[PDB]
Amino acid sequence: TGIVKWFNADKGFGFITPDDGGADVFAHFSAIQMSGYRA
Amino acid sequence: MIREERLLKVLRAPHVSEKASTAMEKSNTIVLKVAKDATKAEIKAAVQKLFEVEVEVVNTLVVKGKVKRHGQRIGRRSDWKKAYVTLKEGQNLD
Amino acid sequence: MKRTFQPSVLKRNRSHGFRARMATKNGRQVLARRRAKGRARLTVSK
RNA sequence: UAAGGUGAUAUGAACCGUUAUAACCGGCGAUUUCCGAAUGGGGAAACCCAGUGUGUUUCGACACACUAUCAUUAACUGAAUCCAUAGGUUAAUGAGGCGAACCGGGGGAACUGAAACAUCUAAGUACCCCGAGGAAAAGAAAUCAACCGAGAUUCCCCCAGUAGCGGCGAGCGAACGGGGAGCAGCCCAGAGCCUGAAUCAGUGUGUGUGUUAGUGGAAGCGUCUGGAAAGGCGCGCGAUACAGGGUGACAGCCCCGUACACAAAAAUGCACAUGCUGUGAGCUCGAUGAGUAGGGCGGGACACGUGGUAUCCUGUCUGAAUA
RNA sequence: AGGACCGAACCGACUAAUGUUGAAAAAUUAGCGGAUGACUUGUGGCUGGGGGUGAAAGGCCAAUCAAACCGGGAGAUAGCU
RNA sequence: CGAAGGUGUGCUGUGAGGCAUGCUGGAGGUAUCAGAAGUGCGAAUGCUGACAUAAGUAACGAUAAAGCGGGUGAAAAGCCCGCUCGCCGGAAGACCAAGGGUUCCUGUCCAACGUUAAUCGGGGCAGGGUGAGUCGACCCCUAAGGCGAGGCCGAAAGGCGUAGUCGAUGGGAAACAGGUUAAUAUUCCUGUACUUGGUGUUACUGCGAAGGGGGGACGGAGAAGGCUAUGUUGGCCGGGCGACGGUUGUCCCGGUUUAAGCGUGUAGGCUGGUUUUCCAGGCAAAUCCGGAAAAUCAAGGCUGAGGCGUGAUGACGAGGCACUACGGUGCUGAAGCAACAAAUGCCCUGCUUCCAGGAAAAGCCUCUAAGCAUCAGGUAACAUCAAAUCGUACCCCAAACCGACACAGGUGGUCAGGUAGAGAAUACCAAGGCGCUUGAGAGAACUCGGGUGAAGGAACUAGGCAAAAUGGUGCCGUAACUUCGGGAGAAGGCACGCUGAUAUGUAGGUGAGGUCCCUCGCGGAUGGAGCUGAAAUCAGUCGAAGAUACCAGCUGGCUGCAACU
Ligand SMILES: [Mg+2]
Ligand SMILES: [Mg+2]
Ligand SMILES: [Mg+2]
Ligand SMILES: [Mg+2]
Ligand SMILES: [Mg+2]
Ligand SMILES: [Mg+2]
Ligand SMILES: [Mg+2]
Ligand SMILES: [Mg+2]
Ligand SMILES: [Mg+2]
Ligand SMILES: [Mg+2]
Ligand SMILES: [Mg+2]
Ligand SMILES: [Mg+2]
Ligand SMILES: [Mg+2]
Ligand SMILES: [Mg+2]
Ligand SMILES: [Mg+2]
Ligand SMILES: [Mg+2]
Ligand SMILES: [Mg+2]
Ligand SMILES: [Mg+2]
Ligand SMILES: [Mg+2]
Ligand SMILES: [Mg+2]
Ligand SMILES: [Mg+2]
Ligand SMILES: [Mg+2]
Ligand SMILES: [Mg+2]
Ligand SMILES: [Mg+2]
Ligand SMILES: [Mg+2]
Ligand SMILES: [Mg+2]
Ligand SMILES: [Mg+2]
Ligand SMILES: [Mg+2]
Ligand SMILES: [Mg+2]
Ligand SMILES: [Mg+2]
Ligand SMILES: [Mg+2]
Ligand SMILES: [Mg+2]
Ligand SMILES: [Mg+2]
Ligand SMILES: [Mg+2]
Ligand SMILES: [Mg+2]
Ligand SMILES: [Mg+2]
Ligand SMILES: [Mg+2]
Ligand SMILES: [Mg+2]
Ligand SMILES: [Mg+2]
Ligand SMILES: [Mg+2]
Numbered sequence A: 001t002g003i004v005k006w007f008n009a010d011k012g013f014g015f016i017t018p019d020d021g022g023a024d025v026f027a028h029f030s031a032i033q034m035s036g037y038r039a
Numbered sequence B: 001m002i003r004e005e006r007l008l009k010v011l012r013a014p015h016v017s018e019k020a021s022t023a024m025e026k027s028n029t030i031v032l033k034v035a036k037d038a039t040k041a042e043i044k045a046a047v048q049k050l051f052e053v054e055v056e057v058v059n060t061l062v063v064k065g066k067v068k069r070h071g072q073r074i075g076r077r078s079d080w081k082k083a084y085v086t087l088k089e090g091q092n093l094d
Numbered sequence C: 001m002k003r004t005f006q007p008s009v010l011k012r013n014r015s016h017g018f019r020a021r022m023a024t025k026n027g028r029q030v031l032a033r034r035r036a037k038g039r040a041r042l043t044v045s046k
Numbered sequence D: 001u002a003a004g005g006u007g008a009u010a011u012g013a014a015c016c017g018u019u020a021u022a023a024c025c026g027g028c029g030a031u032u033u034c035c036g037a038a039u040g041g042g043g044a045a046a047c048c049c050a051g052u053g054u055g056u057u058u059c060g061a062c063a064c065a066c067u068a069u070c071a072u073u074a075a076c077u078g079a080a081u082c083c084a085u086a087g088g089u090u091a092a093u094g095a096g097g098c099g100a101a102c103c104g105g106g107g108g109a110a111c112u113g114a115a116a117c118a119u120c121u122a123a124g125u126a127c128c129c130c131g132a133g134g135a136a137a138a139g140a141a142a143u144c145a146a147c148c149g150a151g152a153u154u155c156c157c158c159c160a161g162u163a164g165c166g167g168c169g170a171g172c173g174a175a176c177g178g179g180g181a182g183c184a185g186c187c188c189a190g191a192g193c194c195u196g197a198a199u200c201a202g203u204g205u206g207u208g209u210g211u212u213a214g215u216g217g218a219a220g221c222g223u224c225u226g227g228a229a230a231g232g233c234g235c236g237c238g239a240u241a242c243a244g245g246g247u248g249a250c251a252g253c254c255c256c257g258u259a260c261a262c263a264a265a266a267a268u269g270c271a272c273a274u275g276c277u278g279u280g281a282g283c284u285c286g287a288u289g290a291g292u293a294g295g296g297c298g299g300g301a302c303a304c305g306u307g308g309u310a311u312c313c314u315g316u317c318u319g320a321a322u323a
Numbered sequence E: 001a002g003g004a005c006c007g008a009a010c011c012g013a014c015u016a017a018u019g020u021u022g023a024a025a026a027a028u029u030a031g032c033g034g035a036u037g038a039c040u041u042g043u044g045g046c047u048g049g050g051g052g053u054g055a056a057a058g059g060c061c062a063a064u065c066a067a068a069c070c071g072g073g074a075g076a077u078a079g080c081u
Numbered sequence F: 001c002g003a004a005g006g007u008g009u010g011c012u013g014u015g016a017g018g019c020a021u022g023c024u025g026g027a028g029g030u031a032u033c034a035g036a037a038g039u040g041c042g043a044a045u046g047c048u049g050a051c052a053u054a055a056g057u058a059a060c061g062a063u064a065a066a067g068c069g070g071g072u073g074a075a076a077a078g079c080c081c082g083c084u085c086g087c088c089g090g091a092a093g094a095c096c097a098a099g100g101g102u103u104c105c106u107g108u109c110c111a112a113c114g115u116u117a118a119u120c121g122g123g124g125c126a127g128g129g130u131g132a133g134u135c136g137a138c139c140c141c142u143a144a145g146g147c148g149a150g151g152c153c154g155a156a157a158g159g160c161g162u163a164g165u166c167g168a169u170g171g172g173a174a175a176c177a178g179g180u181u182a183a184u185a186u187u188c189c190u191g192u193a194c195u196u197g198g199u200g201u202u203a204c205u206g207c208g209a210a211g212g213g214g215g216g217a218c219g220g221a222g223a224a225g226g227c228u229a230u231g232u233u234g235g236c237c238g239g240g241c242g243a244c245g246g247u248u249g250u251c252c253c254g255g256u257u258u259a260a261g262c263g264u265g266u267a268g269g270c271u272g273g274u275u276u277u278c279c280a281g282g283c284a285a286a287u288c289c290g291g292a293a294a295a296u297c298a299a300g301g302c303u304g305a306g307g308c309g310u311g312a313u314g315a316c317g318a319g320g321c322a323c324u325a326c327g328g329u330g331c332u333g334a335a336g337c338a339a340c341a342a343a344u345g346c347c348c349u350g351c352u353u354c355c356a357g358g359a360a361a362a363g364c365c366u367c368u369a370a371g372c373a374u375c376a377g378g379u380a381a382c383a384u385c386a387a388a389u390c391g392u393a394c395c396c397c398a399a400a401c402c403g404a405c406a407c408a409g410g411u412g413g414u415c416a417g418g419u420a421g422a423g424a425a426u427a428c429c430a431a432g433g434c435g436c437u438u439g440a441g442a443g444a445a446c447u448c449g450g451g452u453g454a455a456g457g458a459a460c461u462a463g464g465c466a467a468a469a470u471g472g473u474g475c476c477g478u479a480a481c482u483u484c485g486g487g488a489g490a491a492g493g494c495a496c497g498c499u500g501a502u503a504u505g506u507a508g509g510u511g512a513g514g515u516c517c518c519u520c521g522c523g524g525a526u527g528g529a530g531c532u533g534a535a536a537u538c539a540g541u542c543g544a545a546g547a548u549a550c551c552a553g554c555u556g557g558c559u560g561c562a563a564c565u
């Protein structure tokens, strides 16, 4: 899930730093996998 | 006598929750997010002055902050404090 | 088997902590070395 | 100084501002949680527990300040013990800690080399400790020289890998003298006479020069290729500016700049100048650094390893004369 | 009563087999010894490197010990490869 | 109008090389002659990265075990639901400390991590969640030990250490039951309590310490007795009348719970009380302690498990009654007794005994000193206020800790059901929790772990290695030797089940009703109901076998060494 860039609770909307669960972010996690793997 | 400026800097926000809605409708207890250095007497004075409502007792707990990973960078949220403020019977608050 | 690290925070801080380092002359030289190298965690102490 | 802004990843939201308290830059200020020399006591750093005093109180209690240690000074007090002294307490001033190198000092290696190794070397090196400053240290001849003379200290080039030292092995290695950089001399051990007289320090003021934001800053068009011209081909212009960088390919003339010309409300350095405060200047007559020099023993430093070994230092025992 | 007896917990580790790029940088399985004592265990503390400690094997001192580890002298030296 | 670089081709030189050009590429390159080098790599068990090989091989982590139906879903051996099966059950269950630090719960996703798939997850992402006067920490107190004003010592650094100050693993006030959340509860709610400080009134009036004394305050082993936890049975209440012969009964299943506190003061343990006088002691004092006397009374006091009553007309309670988003939510609610057995828990910090002779300090109680003198303070009641802060989720013998792993290892404390059993062994089960994150087949050699074995029975072998065997209780009986304790469980042997009788269940244990007495109660006799209940003898009877399973010594002889543990 996008982490919240910021969320207007006025009507419960707003923008969200789209960590999105970001398998892309977790793809950086997989890069970390290779890194600590190399370690 | 607790000073009004501190009493104005004590309270941060109300905490919305299913448990908070339960305590509000059953035990007549509101759940507040307060300042971290706030004590029970400062909270009771703030609700009794700033909300004009009769406080029976205040229960507090410290919430430990979670550890998050924004993208791939690790991070940790702040510890915050939560107060269960039991109002006396008959008192009502928005 | 019983391995060599059986943790205890009290013994960790009494043995390797900040005030134990700041107590003696040589321990103060340790903190001067870690500051010169630029360590983020200068000691054990959280 | 300004027409654009509310730091970044990083949009967006809600807003500010456009001739001047929008923003930005600089100067002086204000705030400056907690730990940390940490200094109220403690402590497993970022935590725990207080005391006194002055204020408030809607009596629930709040707020603020102070309280470390040591050195020095002063006051009061004050034992055994008469005075006394030790000791106690207050108060004031200061210190404390950190930090790259350089510097001075107190200690002080070994590997290695010697084709082994113990004297020696490595090396007074590495390292530890103490203390200081922007430099420190040293420093104004009980010095050299050679019968001529020089004239504090420090640094550089020579002298010279010389003279020497040395299991005379490995290796260590000057000085005199010469050329230069730079140059500066004074005071107390003491009275007087004239008395505040030089200089220095401090503090002001004033001027100049910087520094900490800044301002202006020249001069090119057309055409071809090409996604794009700064390129090619033409024709001009600037230059105390063809340093440099950027712009859709390589730009003196697009931009930022550069040469050059200026600029500071405020703070500050440095120069001068001078006020004030303190400081003494000069002349005469004197005086001329004693457990010291030197010596014995043991070590150390001098290039010099005790040698025929001068000189210097001193742990120990002694111990002069004194222009 | 007992450094008494048999025997679980607990402590230990005699034998065999497995395994030996293991399940495991010393273990499992079946048996084995002690088991009120010179017992065992938890927490905290003390002893520091030519030093500690040691019912003493040159044993142990963080999977490292006929002199720990780390950093430095240090690019030790190497007539040897 | 296409540089370097990359990739080809052609040509050329004796060689290191050189030139041209095609393609890619899309912006730099550089003649000549001189100059300077981090100037040319195939090796150094060279360094770094990438990719091979063995090889789609070994393995997929305890041989506790799975099968089916339905669901979801793109897809199901692994997820959810259900019915069966199996495993632990002194643990493979539950609660914690340490340690970890959000792993907790909910929604959602499946790339990666999960030794397979994955719709699942301790994985990713988002949200939510930890509530205390009584639990714990902090705090008061100190141990070992550390620091250490001054101080003593030391080239410096610094070492030791007084007053002190830290330091738990130990001492110090107080809360229980029930209910509830997706996730916290001795923390919330209901009920009922408790503690310590304050201030204030009122009565009363010796208060006072950095000092004195007491207390805290302490060992090992052993023996019983009293209890309780808990269990069993009976009774009671509710339900049932049986898929296959029988089962209205001497039948089956389930339930039969209740706290802190307050009052009583018991079993039982210790103890002589009381008054006055005096006193070289306790740094001074003392009314306190200690010590001398005298008098009087034998009977006062301290401690104390449990029980009983209350708490409790309550709560809980099998089940029902109803709605239902099938999760649930609401309402109602019977009986709720007795006997026996019984702890390693409690009385017990006790009693007895031994030698190896068994923390400190504060809190607490008391005494006075200076001081205060009618003020302060003291305790007594009542009222009122306060009790802060931090922790609290989750794992915790483990997939979350130490082991590089979701590792067959290691890890301190607490609870301790049933049947058999001496037992916390062991076997089967309960509560509760799991089936160990690859499966499906086949049923070769060989290996691993086991089962049985003709005849023989150590001939194997370095060697009876390993296996096999023995194994219990009771009784009989038991050698050399000896330090007189032993050896010795020597060796060796007999009995062992079930049923009936003795005795419709005995001896024994427990002990009611009832009655009597009393200085009256948690009393003392008597009394035996009821419950429980070995062991033995006799007769019979079954099987090949009665310590039938698990469990559970092989024995003896000679000798070396060391006394032994
Ligand atoms: Mg409450
Ligand atoms: Mg911004
Ligand atoms: Mg402090
Ligand atoms: Mg301190
Ligand atoms: Mg040597
Ligand atoms: Mg040498
Ligand atoms: Mg040599
Ligand atoms: Mg000087
Ligand atoms: Mg400009
Ligand atoms: Mg211009
Ligand atoms: Mg280009
Ligand atoms: Mg002189
Ligand atoms: Mg001399
Ligand atoms: Mg001499
Ligand atoms: Mg001499
Ligand atoms: Mg002398
Ligand atoms: Mg024994
Ligand atoms: Mg075993
Ligand atoms: Mg035994
Ligand atoms: Mg040996
Ligand atoms: Mg080791
Ligand atoms: Mg050593
Ligand atoms: Mg050595
Ligand atoms: Mg060297
Ligand atoms: Mg080398
Ligand atoms: Mg091309
Ligand atoms: Mg190039
Ligand atoms: Mg090319
Ligand atoms: Mg090319
Ligand atoms: Mg190569
Ligand atoms: Mg080669
Ligand atoms: Mg190679
Ligand atoms: Mg392959
Ligand atoms: Mg093969
Ligand atoms: Mg194969
Ligand atoms: Mg295979
Ligand atoms: Mg598995
Ligand atoms: Mg497996
Ligand atoms: Mg299925
Ligand atoms: Mg499976």
Ligand SMILES: [Mg+2]
Pocket: none
């Ligand atoms: Mg299932």
Ligand SMILES: [Mg+2]
Pocket: F087
């Ligand atoms: Mg089973």
Ligand SMILES: [Mg+2]
Pocket: none
């Ligand atoms: Mg996480």
Ligand SMILES: [Mg+2]
Pocket: none
């Ligand atoms: Mg979960």
Ligand SMILES: [Mg+2]
Pocket: F107, F108
């Ligand atoms: Mg979820």
Ligand SMILES: [Mg+2]
Pocket: none
């Ligand atoms: Mg998939």
Ligand SMILES: [Mg+2]
Pocket: none
């Ligand atoms: Mg997978």
Ligand SMILES: [Mg+2]
Pocket: none
């Ligand atoms: Mg998760």
Ligand SMILES: [Mg+2]
Pocket: B060, F132
């Ligand atoms: Mg709390």
Ligand SMILES: [Mg+2]
Pocket: none
């Ligand atoms: Mg507590």
Ligand SMILES: [Mg+2]
Pocket: F139, F140
């Ligand atoms: Mg306390």
Ligand SMILES: [Mg+2]
Pocket: none
């Ligand atoms: Mg002590």
Ligand SMILES: [Mg+2]
Pocket: F148, F161
């Ligand atoms: Mg000390």
Ligand SMILES: [Mg+2]
Pocket: none
């Ligand atoms: Mg001192």
Ligand SMILES: [Mg+2]
Pocket: F165, F166
């Ligand atoms: Mg202390």
Ligand SMILES: [Mg+2]
Pocket: F166
């Ligand atoms: Mg203390």
